Nucleic acid binder design. Sequence first.
RNA 1: GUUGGGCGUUGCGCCAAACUCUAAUUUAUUGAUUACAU
Lengths: 185, 534
Amino acid sequence: WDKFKAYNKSLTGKADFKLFFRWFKELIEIENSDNADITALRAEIRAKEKDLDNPLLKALLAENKNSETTKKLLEDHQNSLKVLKEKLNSYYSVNSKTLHTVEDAMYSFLPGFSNLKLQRAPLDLIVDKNNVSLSVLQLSQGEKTILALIADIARRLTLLNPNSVNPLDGTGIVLIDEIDLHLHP
Amino acid sequence: QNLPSRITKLIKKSESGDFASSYQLYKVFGSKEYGVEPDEKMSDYFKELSAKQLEGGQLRVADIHLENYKGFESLIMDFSMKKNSTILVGNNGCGKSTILDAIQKGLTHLSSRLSTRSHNGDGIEKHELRKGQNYASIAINYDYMGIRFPMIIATTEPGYEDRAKSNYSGINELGSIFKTAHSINPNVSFPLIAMYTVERANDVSTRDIENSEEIKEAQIWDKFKAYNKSLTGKADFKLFFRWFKELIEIENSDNADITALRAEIRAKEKDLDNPLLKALLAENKNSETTKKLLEDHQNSLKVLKEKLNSYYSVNSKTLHTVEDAMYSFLPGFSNLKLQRAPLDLIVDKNNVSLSVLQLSQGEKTILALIADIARRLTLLNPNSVNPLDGTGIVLIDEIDLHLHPSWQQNIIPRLEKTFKNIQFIVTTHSPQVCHTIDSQNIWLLKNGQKFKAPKGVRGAISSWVLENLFEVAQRPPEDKYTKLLQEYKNLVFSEKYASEDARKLGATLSQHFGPDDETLVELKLEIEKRIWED
RNA sequence: GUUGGGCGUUGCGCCAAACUCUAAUUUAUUGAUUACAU
Ligand SMILES: Nc1ncnc2c1ncn2[C@@H]1O[C@H](COP(=O)(O)OP(=O)(O)O)[C@@H](O)[C@H]1O
C-alpha cells in the first residue's frame, strides 16, 4: 500500500462483475479471517450511521427544539461517528478500509439500499432493501458493469488517498467512453 | 368393496412394518393397472409411511456369482450380514482384485440409477472375457432391511446369438424407492458407494491443491453430487480442499457477524441506559411520541436478542466431526489449519508446523482416504446428530499400502469404531491385518476357488496365521543359517549328539542368533538331559 | 447359524430336544389340489 502499486495499469481500465465478485469475496473474507478487531469497529460504524436515520427520532429532532439539550445530543452522536471513523483511520490498513469505502460507493450510487452481506452456501451476494434481493442473479446486465466501474473508482481513489476520512473525495480525471453502454432508459 | 387378498396381505405387512410393502401399496392405489381403483389420499398415506420406515436400515451386498470372468470359472460367495468387515487373502495371481472389479461395474450401475437419470454404466469388455469362452455373467444381490434386490450383468461375443441378456429389475426398484423418499423429505439419508484403488498412492500433490479454487461452485454442495468420480478410485483431494476452504470460511465469516451482533447489543444497551438520554427523556414521559420511540427501541432490542439467539444454535459441526474423526485415525496430528500465502494447508505434529504436501507418503494416503469418506458421508447425510453413521459399501483395495506394521493392527477396528454402520469388504496381503477379524469372515482364494479360513484366525501368534493362511514358512525356506538350524536339530534328536559336527554347529549357531534365544536353549537343555541319561 | 415337539397372561413368549456336502420358502382376475355355499 504505497499509492503507486495500483496507480499504474489504470490507463486502460476494466469494469466487469466477474472480476469484482472474486475481488470482493477475498476482500470481505481476508479482512475477517485475520485482524478481526477492525470488523467490530466497522460493524458498529454501520450501526451508528444507520440508526441516526430513524424517522421517529428524526421527526422529533425536526420538531420544536428550543432546548439546547437536543442540539447537544445531536452534536454528541455526530462526534461519536467522527471519533469512530478517526479510530478506523488511525488503524492504517490496506484490504480493511477499502471494503468500507467500496460499500459506501454502492450505498450511495444505488439510493436507499441497506447493508450488503455475502452468503456462502449459495454465493448470492445480497443487497438489502426493505425486501431482500440478489445481485449475482438479478440486477440486469449493465447494472453490474456500472457497479463494477464505481467499485473500481472507489478502490483506486481510496488507495491513492491515505487518511482522508471520506476517501471518495479526491480529485482528478476519469474518462468514460459511451457511458450509455448497457443501460435501461 | 372386496379388497383383494394380496392387498390385505400387503396392508398387514405394512402394519407389521416394511418399506417395500408400502411402496407396492402407493403404486397399487395410484394407478388403474394393478387392478384396484385409484385412491389418491390413501396412496399418499402409504407413500409417506414407506418413506418414513426407510430410516435405520443398512445397505449391504449379500452374495455374488461370477461366471467366466477374468480368472474365475464359477464362483459363489456369501458375505456376512451380522459382521461389518470381509477380508480377501490370497496369492498375487489368484483373483482377489477380480472380485472387487466385479462388485464394481454393478456398483457403478446402482450409483448411476440412484443419482442420475442416465440409466447407463459399466459393462464387461471384450478383453475381460475368459480366454476361450464366449459368454460371461456377473450377478449381485443387494440387501436392505432383510429384503433383497436381484441383479445380473452379462455379455456375449458378437459372433454367436446372446445367451445371457442383461437384467436390472431390483436396482431400478431401489433407486425409485430412494428417490421417492427424497421427494417426500429432502433430508433422507442415502447409502455411500465408493472404491479406493491402489492409485490412491499419488492422491495428494501440490498440483492438485494449486488450482483447487478454480473449479465449478455447484459440483460439491448437494446430496446427489457425492457420486461423481467416486468409484474411479483416486480418493479426491482437490474437491476436499475446496470443501475445507468453504467450511473454514463459513466459520471465519460467521461468528464475526455474531461478534458484531453482540457488540451491537452492547451498544444498544448503552444507548438505552445513556444517563444523559434517560434524563432528557424523563422531562416529557407522558408524551405519546416519547413512549412510542422507547417502546420501539425496546422491541428492536428484543428482536436483536432473538437474532443473536438464531445463530446461537448453529453449531456447525460439519468441520468438527470431520476433524475429530480424522485426528483419531492418524495419531499425534492435531490443529489442522489453512495458510493463504501459497494456498496450502498446515498441520501440526510433535509441536512442528508442516504442510500436507510435504508429509510422509504413508500418512497422506490415509489422510485423503479418511477425508474423502468423511466428506462423502457428510454430503450424503443431511443435518443429523451424527453424520458419519451412514450406510453403504466401501471397497478399500490393498489396504497394506504405505502402512508400517504397527497401524495394521489398528486400522480395521478403528474404521469400524469411527464408522460403525459401513460394510468394509477389503483385500490385503499383510499378515498383521488378518489377526484382528473372526476366522469366519476371511475368504482365502487360490486356483480360482474359495477356501474358508482355519479355526481361530483372531488374535493369535503371527507366525501361525502366516503359516496357515499364506502357506509361507515362519523361517526362511532357503537360507544357509536356517539349513544349519535344521541340520543341528535333526542330529540333536538322533545319533551324533556329541560328535564331530555337534559342537561346531552349536558354536556357529551360538555366534549368531545370540547364545540366549528360544530354540537353542531348548536344544541345549534336551541334549544335556539325554547325555545325562546315557 | 437351521428343524421338529410341549405348556398357555397364545396374529407368539417360554420350556424341553436335535442337525452341520464350504451353501434358506414368495404370482392372480391362470391352471392343478383341500375345504364350505351349491
Ligand atoms: N482373458 C484371460 N484369460 C486367462 N486368464 C485371465 C484372463 N483375464 C484375466 N485373467 C486372470 O486374471 C488374474 C489377475 O489377477 P487379479 O484379478 O489382478 O487379482 P490379484 O491382484 O489379487 O492378483 C490373472 O491371474 C489372470 O490370469
